[PDB]
């Protein structure tokens, strides 16, 4: 793969109780990634950018909710969530 694509994959860390739970207990991190990226490219991109060892990447797609702003009905955008398994080996931390 090209690196240029890689740096475009990973949007953001996903923050929530489930997230924290897996991160502590099972050694796994949770990511909002570009809607079109695949398990290959996410494996590649974490292994590359955070420089740590990925075991496997499980994913799902979140359908955005439907909202009302001032009677108007909008639709929050979709997106893709990735559970990323790190081997027990690495320890990734928050400073």
């Amino acid at each position: 793969i090209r690196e240029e694509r890689l740096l475009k994959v990973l949007r953001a860390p996903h923050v929530s109780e489930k997230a924290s739970t897996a991160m502590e207990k099972s050694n796994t991190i949770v990511l909002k990634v570009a809607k079109d990226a695949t398990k290959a490219e996410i494996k590649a991109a974490v292994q590359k950018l955070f420089e740590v060892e990925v075991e496997v990447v499980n994913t799902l797609v979140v359908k955005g909710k439907v909202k009302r702003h001032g009677q108007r009905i909008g639709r929050r955008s979709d997106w893709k969530k990735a559970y990323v398994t790190l081997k027990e080996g690495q320890n990734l931390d928050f400073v």
Partner: peptide, 18 residues
């Protein structure tokens, strides 16, 4: 430079995301 800007922009939105 393009590869460096890419890193920097990735880093920046990683900050903004946190």
């Amino acid at each position: 430079e393009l590869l460096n800007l890419l890193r920097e922009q990735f880093n920046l939105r990683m900050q903004a995301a946190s």
